[PDB]
Ligand SMILES: CC1=CC(=O)CC(C)(C)[C@@]1(O)/C=C/C(C)=C\C(=O)O
């Protein structure tokens with residue numbers, strides 16, 4: 001399910017080059033994750049695109065606040081409860097292309113400020129012999145740790161798990 | 175749907191729920207119960223669940239686990255759990271409270287480790303279902319914890335619920351894969 | 355990160371990062387980029403860096419490195435690196451991917467051995483800086499590996515320490 | 530050069546070397562001694578080195594370390610060291626063998642955890658140098674491990690040197 005076929009990988013190469021390839025600052029790193037979803041890509045995109053409702057697919061979110069709300073440069077506050085004194089994160093919508101199904105955001109303030117976290121998600125339609133399905137790609141770039149508590153392992157784990165929830169939610173909707 | 179019991183499942187499980195997963199709460203404490211359907215034999219699921227020395231086999235977030243040398247699994251034995259960074263705690267020392275191989279019940283209590291969970295105690299029970307010719311499992315897990323001094327700090331329950339739910343999902347994925 | 359690169363250094367390195375240190379990732383992999391400033395001439399640093407047969411000069415945890423007898427360095431050649439960071443010493447077979455003496459770029463892939471499954475590939479570049487008559491060096495080293503048991507924090511740590519050893523060595527030599 | 534003693538340093542240190550860093554080795558065991566010059570006051574260096582509960586302050590490769598709650602630092606106390614992945618161990622439990630604040634000497638033995646370093650015992654001594662009206666520190670650290678051997682010795686030597694290098698860096702940053 002996170003393991004793409006060679007057919008899928010060839011089809012995704014141009015999108016990876018375009019949206020998921022970062023020019024790194026020294027002291028940073030990037031990861032790319034994939035998730036196959038047995039649902040139509042318009043349905044998956046309808047969930048993914050909702051900047052105000054990350055809790056639908058992401059774990060560890062208490063709440064998300066944005067009022068009479070969606071545009072590039074919009075911000076959200078995500079209260080997360082993966083920290084037990086609940087933490088707030090301020091995130092900005094960097095990209096939103098409904099025709100090409102691309103969105104992304106950056107963490108611009110709050111507890112994980114020093115991470116310079118930036119992420120992009122793309123949604124992709126596959127069709128083989130009357131069967132239609134979806135692949136989601138999600139990549140991020142983050143600063144590497146300077147100063148004991150590196151959370152990049154946790155960042156990868158959570159993306160993986162989040163994408164797994166997205167597949168579950170979307171497949172149950174379909 | 176994997177985490178939501180059918181009426182037939184919850185009818186059959188009433189007595190188990192009353193015996194192991196029903197709590198009369200003190201002030202400053204919270205509990206919750208989670209269910210997880212697994213398409214695998216209960217004896218296989220139980221063989222994973224009972225391994226007190228290997229929680230990493232079915233739990234996320236565990237870097238490693240150590241137990242005493244010449245480990246004999248008996249109630250009262252402890253394990254030292256090492257978690258990955260990014261979480262409210264990086265270690266947990268846990269005590270085996272119950273190990274009943276006949277009835278398929280375990281449970282543990284968090285004794286120590288630096289974290290925000292105080293007096294956490296959980297119980298896991300494993301249940302056989304058979305219909306027509308098919309066999310499947312339901313796992314129930316409940317916990318009680320002390321909630322912090324923020325009054326109804328729903329943060330603690332929200333955090334533990336997520337972890338427990340994710341760990342039950344992994345248990346299902348692991349047992350199912352093993353069944354194949 | 356030697357300590358941190360200046361805005362001027364970063365600006366000057368943009369083009370090299372784009373050319374040599376940006377990877378088109380496979381799903382399930384990650385890439386990381388480290389820098390080290392070195393107060394020594396670039397030709398000196400490169401003379402150490404380019405020696406595929408002698409990684410032990412700048413890298414940690416190497417028991418030995420062996421190559422072909424009468425070694426002639428060119429792309430496609432391999433080395434066996436016995437590493438001691440595992441206590442039942444492990445061996446790594448690594449392939450020289452790039453060598454450009456004119457532009458000071460080299461890189462290798464792990465093709466066999468204990469961490470063969472990681473699909474590790476790394477690139478090192480050496481850069482000359484001159485401002486107001488002092489001359490110095492920045493080294494960039496990047497890698498890509500599959501994500502898994504997760505030894506990638508060790509991989510970043512060891513790259514950082516290795517670059518620190520390169521700086522210490524080259525700076526001593528320049529004296 | 531910082532890991533390399535001068536003849537004047539080693540001559541003064543002959544006494545300390547003989548007392549703490551010289552070994553009568555049972556077969557199947559090996560020992561090694563390392564040195565690190567630190568341009569910082571020995572009291573600062575000792576204040577870091579003596580902190581049995583905080584080895585991450587000067588050691589590489591440590592994810593975390595815990596000591597029993599309400600810990601008081603005395604010979605016989607233990608710590609549980611958690612190490613990042615990629616190395617021969619996940620964990621190490623270590624016992625404080627020596628803690629002499631007057632003479633600036635500690636040491637510890639590994640008594641458990643899963644790795645390949647059985648009966649590892651090390652001793653660390655911190656030394657003052659003055660000559661003349663200019664002050665620096667030399668740290669000596671030696672260990673005895675029994676092997677399953679160049680490999681065991683090469684590994685431990687690597688860690689010890691790296692850790693001494695960090696100690697020097699961290700101390701020198703604090704002195705600034
Ligand atoms: C993953 C993690 C993070 C923490 O902050 C607390 C603790 C370390 C105990 C924990 O292991 C939590 C474990 C829980 C809730 C349940 C379990 O294990 O059945």
Ligand SMILES: CC1=CC(=O)CC(C)(C)[C@@]1(O)/C=C/C(C)=C\C(=O)O
Pocket residue numbers: 588589590610612616617618619620621639644645646651684685688689692
């Ligand atoms: C870094 C590491 C890797 C291991 O495999 C063993 C162990 C966990 C003991 C260790 O902490 C080793 C520590 C050593 C040699 C010395 C020290 O700490 O003074």
